[PDB]
Symmetry: C3
Subunit: 261 residues, 3 copies
């Protein structure tokens, strides 16, 4: 590994766009954790608290994920394959010019850890049975891991996009459960309004990621590294922080509705 | 060596490329077929079994792609005394010491078997305790096997990892063939387990036997034959076996429901 | 480009390192035997589930310690400026090498074994699913963020930030085990054994973050050799004896936990 972790860390700092897209989220994730733990202090029902802890875990994983990226621990320099729209790039790391693209794979590694929690909270709010919850979660993880594999794949351009297509198929499974299955389960659960709201927000925001992947450096490359990074951090601010705040706003005011068992 | 160089090593070699790309394609077709076959299930418990099984070829088309792209393939120099020691291969167009190691296979098993196990356990009316015990040791088995494959410091260490792993294997096989076959009687599903009993014992024992005999073990099977031995097993386990389980599940939805 | 073969030889020919690692392999091995023996009497599925979660602990340990012993889970890393271990060197093969022999494999031991002992202590206390889900997730986040700290070499300050995140997660777990579960056990019938262990718990669970901060990963008052025995000493207490005291109570009180 020619490029050191210190060097990548230094490249992030010194790069205004990059460093801000990263450090701003370590900050917002921390404040989110503090606000969430405070908002839910009055919950007592175990099923209501399971929804609150899973929610809270989202920014908890987020602050760790971004610290991994900012430290350089979860960043690597890869060389795109022939034909990849970003093939032939250089990053100027340390003092020399290194071939390749600064790859922030750390985003994928942790999405596989935070998104299931989001899914678990939304399934429970909707009063979902174990089967649909297992189906939503297992495919979500697969969607995130194949995403991480595509980003990590440098041997073949066509391979990169094959991983991507596998990931989309797994994505549609989750989407179908959100829009079709849980939408209906929410009625019987008495949480229709809030679910339909959070459901529409989820579908809209989540669609943003595979769009950014395809337009950013890892895909067709119209967005340079610094910009795809901000595209991902901005989706994160809504998809994770504001979204979790909204779900917890309902829960903390309607404990009785989801209290069941 | 480079990822692309490994990717090209697999393409360009009929034995290797076939042992991998064929698994990618059959896994793809099996996901469709499995989703199709089960389009009619209605019971939640049955459906859990069907999705857990469907995940088998999903994990397979993904993990094999990891291998074919070279992402999960690596080159390792075997320890002194190992029967494959002093091997070399030619990758970046040059003599590279070591053996191409498809460590991605352990990922495939560590992720798909927990799913087939969950499916079988539920089918057998297993309680939580035996389901847990089986899945945990099944995973410890798959991972210690991986450890064995990646160990290059000592020849004896690899075999010690193997012993650790085989131990976890009998724990899993025991509940699979013995415990669950017995629980299935009360669940009204004893027959699917006896019909697939020989198929199950042969394919499962098939993996630790291929290890010992292939490049990772005593090496009477070269890298390419080692790849095809594991691949022919996977084809049986991830596709035909899963199909059989699914074929039964669909005909017995009501009873598996309760 | 140090090899796994050189790391394996480094541990051997290094008395302290070799014994801290090899004594644990041996002790975890017997444990699996002794624990299998002590619990062959069990019949209750709930008592047995608790029994196997606990047996999985020494299994995880003998396997993870073998990873370390084999060199598989060891690496040489260079510490960042200001770090007390920065500027370290180690003899590997036929040349001097910058860095610190990093036993990152230990974090995989804790990440995989602790959720089991937590799933054994929770069920033993009668814990509902919410607490059991909390304690373990934050426990896992703790183990993984600790590794991140150990794996971070770009910034001295970042290591301690990672260590602070890990420590906060650590607080959630200790609050569940010491307080919540302590209460739940009263309605479980198993409040007395939960007490004593809870006491040994505090001391040993705290022992880890204290060692981290004082060993080569922290301010390094303890060299690589001593941090390893420090952790190995703690694992003996938690993975074997603690597991023994737990099983000793279980197998002599299957009626109380039965259900
Ligand atoms: C810029 C300053 C930051 C201000 C943040 C204010 C958010 C506080 C929201 O309060 C919480 O609302 C819940 C109902 O939804 C109540 O149950 C709970 O008791 C109450 O504490
Ligand atoms: C079912 C999904 C599997 C996808 C398999 C993709 C195989 C594509 C092989 O492409 C070729 O690779 C060579 C490298 O060896 C290049 O030199 C050559 O220019 C390129 O055209
Ligand atoms: C906190 C993060 C969130 C909610 C992330 C969501 C991410 C996705 C929905 C990602 C999806 C992708 C695909 C469907 C295709 C391949 C690439 C990915 C991983 C970007
Ligand atoms: C994909 C389907 C199945 C049934 C896979 C089974 C895998 C095993 C039984 C693997 C076993 C191993 C053992 C027992 C010993 C060390 C090496 C292996 C991991 C190959
Ligand atoms: C193997 C058994 C036990 C009980 C292990 C416990 C481990 C911890 C409590 C580890 C804690 C850490 C913290 C809080 C901070 C970062 C570094 C550590 C991972 C060592
Ligand atoms: Br609770
Ligand atoms: Br994340
Ligand atoms: Br269902
Ligand atoms: Br399988
Ligand atoms: Br049992
Ligand atoms: Br433990």
């Amino acid at each position: 590994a020619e490029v050191t972790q210190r060097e990548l860390f230094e490249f992030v700092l010194n790069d205004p766009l990059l460093a801000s897209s990263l450090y701003i989220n370590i900050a917002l994730a921390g404040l989110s954790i503090l606000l969430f733990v405070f908002m839910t202090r009055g919950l007592d029902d175990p099923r209501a608290k399971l929804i609150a802890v899973s929610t809270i875990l989202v920014p908890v994983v987020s602050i760790a994920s971004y610290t991994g990226l900012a430290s350089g621990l979860t960043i690597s320099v890869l060389e795109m394959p022939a034909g990849h729209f970003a093939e032939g790039s250089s990053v100027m790391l340390g003092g020399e010019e290194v071939d390749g693209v600064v790859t922030m794979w750390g985003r994928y590694l942790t999405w596989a850890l935070s998104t299931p929690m989001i899914l678990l909270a939304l399934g429970l709010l909707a009063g979902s049975n174990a089967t649909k919850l297992f189906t939503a979660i297992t495919f979500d993880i697969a969607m995130c891991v194949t995403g991480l594999a595509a980003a990590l794949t440098t041997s073949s351009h066509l391979m990169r996009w094959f991983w991507y297509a596998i990931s989309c198929a797994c994505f549609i499974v989750v989407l179908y459960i959100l829009l079709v299955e849980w939408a209906q389960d929410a009625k019987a659960a008495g949480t229709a309004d809030i679910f339909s709201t959070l459901k529409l927000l989820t579908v809209v925001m989540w669609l943003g990621y595979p769009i950014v992947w395809a337009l950013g450096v890892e895909g067709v490359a119209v967005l340079p590294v610094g910009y795809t990074s901000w595209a991902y951090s901005a989706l994160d601010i809504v998809a994770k922080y504001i979204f979790a705040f909204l779900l917890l706003n309902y829960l903390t005011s309607n404990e009785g509705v989801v209290s069941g068992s």
